[PDB]
Design a protein around this ligand. Sequence first.
Ligand code: SMQ
Ligand code: SMQ
Ligand code: CA
Ligand code: CL
Ligand code: CL
Ligand code: CL
Ligand code: CL
Ligand code: CL
Ligand code: CL
Ligand code: CL
Ligand code: CL
Lengths: 232, 242
Amino acid sequence: EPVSIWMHPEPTLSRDQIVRAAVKVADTEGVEAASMRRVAAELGAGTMSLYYYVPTKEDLVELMVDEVIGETRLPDRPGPDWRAALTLAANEKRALWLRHPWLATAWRNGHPVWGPNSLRQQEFVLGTLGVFDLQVDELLSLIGLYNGYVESFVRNEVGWLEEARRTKVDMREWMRRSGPYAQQLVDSGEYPMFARVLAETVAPHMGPDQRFRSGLERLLDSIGASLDRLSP
Amino acid sequence: PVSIWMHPEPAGRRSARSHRTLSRDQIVRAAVKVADTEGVEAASMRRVAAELGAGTMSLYYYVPTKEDLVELMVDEVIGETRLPDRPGPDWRAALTLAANEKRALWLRHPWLATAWRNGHPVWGPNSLRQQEFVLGTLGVFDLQVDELLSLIGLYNGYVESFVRNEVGWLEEARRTKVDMREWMRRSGPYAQQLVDSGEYPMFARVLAETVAPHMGPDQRFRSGLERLLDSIGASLDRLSPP
Ligand SMILES: CC(=O)O[C@@H]1[C@@H](C)O[C@@H](c2ccc3c(c2O)[C@H](O)[C@]24O[C@@]2(C3=O)[C@@]2(O)C(=O)C=C(C)C[C@@]2(O)C[C@@H]4O)C[C@H]1OC(=O)/C=C/C=C/C=C/C=C/C(=O)O
Ligand SMILES: CC(=O)O[C@@H]1[C@@H](C)O[C@@H](c2ccc3c(c2O)[C@H](O)[C@]24O[C@@]2(C3=O)[C@@]2(O)C(=O)C=C(C)C[C@@]2(O)C[C@@H]4O)C[C@H]1OC(=O)/C=C/C=C/C=C/C=C/C(=O)O
Ligand SMILES: [Ca+2]
Ligand SMILES: [Cl-]
Ligand SMILES: [Cl-]
Ligand SMILES: [Cl-]
Ligand SMILES: [Cl-]
Ligand SMILES: [Cl-]
Ligand SMILES: [Cl-]
Ligand SMILES: [Cl-]
Ligand SMILES: [Cl-]
């Protein structure tokens, strides 16, 4: 039976060096550029000798994820103020993804990453609502609202940065250039919800940081409303 | 760069050595079939041309870049969703229908979970029509546009995360031969070592008390979706007191 990288003890070179060097490549070149042969060259080592520490590309990615999650700066305990605690975790996750853009898209597996940094972060996040009388699956559903918002926002933010390096058209410029088509769509009268969105939305005109915070505040109100009903 | 939705499409044309007339639609449809069977990376201009019995360069007359092709493919398959013109007066039932149609679509075309790496939205006609339906489900409540979009954000965040993870398991298992249920079996001993450490009590509680993972995929999706709809409902109430 193939053994989890987390159950697979590691014996000049080390697993951590290999992982950190891989991360440094992916940060600027993407995860596909962080091949073993590339990471080997970065460490002045022979490629075959890397496999002794990290048996596969798949395992390298999983190690890379857990390694970076270790960079977040969370207190030991979430404390009683769940809003502040989730805001703190939200801001840290956003900053982490923007430092490591590949996090938004590198993971195409189903299985979760059960390395020590991810488990430690999960304690903090799951613990934020431990002071309400929730069943586990109620808890996990509310935390899914939180993760859903943060990851969707930042995945899109990192999509725009990626897209703009290809096209040199960023979000603001994209909205400017799409205006004549948007008007054509509104004037057709076929998309009245869309027309309402365009006429009335505020979010796209704020900077990214206040747009993130303003969505977070609404997200947290949505969790608070559910808490009112579940644990009254 | 003119967007693909504004890029005027030339007349259908048959190259002298080809049996079939070439059009944008026929190229996108042939691309979708390739992506379904072999993934989006395999659907190079050449491969898609081979499926059509056409020369590679003649495709570029109809679709100028791979990215436009992908945007076209995304909009094409979204046309497959089966939604009525208007959502109707039951918002839970309407978002339930859209959730189940999106999940089935992503299961038919699993590259939808991963192939879109851009920031810009797809404003093709199939996407805009589905967006009207989805946005329309809460349009009758007294909601500011950005409260509406935050609530629809909850809906999409749930459906996409679930199905992205579902399709991930399927892809992962084609490589490893271990699906989710088997992965849970094989990970038992390690999970028990983590619990035994005493360093992860929330994790221990989760492993002890979670029900969802033990359900079959349809029941798990439904049961999460009901909980998501309960949260949207608590928000709808609280947004318009008393
Ligand atoms: C995320 C995203 O899609 O973000 C979009 C951004 C890139 O682009 C934003 C965008 C684009 C263009 C404009 C605007 C945008 O905000 C402006 O607001 C704008 O509307 C503009 C304008 O071009 C205007 O200038 C103009 O040129 C023409 C018109 C007719 C109106 C204006 O005159 C007035 C206003 O200036 C809107 C925003 O749309 C939304 O927020 C859409 C949200 C839709 C949620 C869909 C969920 C559906 C779920 C599902 O199917 O499961
Ligand atoms: C999505 C996912 O991660 O899905 C996981 C699935 C693949 O795997 C599920 C999983 C795995 C293993 C087992 C189980 C699982 O459910 C079982 O429930 C299990 O717990 C099992 C067992 O192996 C057991 O058999 C066993 O071998 C060992 C122990 C200690 C207990 C059992 O004896 C009893 C029980 O049968 C857990 C589930 O965890 C969750 O559902 C976790 C939700 C995590 C949310 C974290 C939010 C973090 C956010 C953030 O940091 O921003
Ligand atoms: Ca508030
Ligand atoms: Cl990447
Ligand atoms: Cl490699
Ligand atoms: Cl490998
Ligand atoms: Cl941008
Ligand atoms: Cl800002
Ligand atoms: Cl793919
Ligand atoms: Cl599975
Ligand atoms: Cl089922």
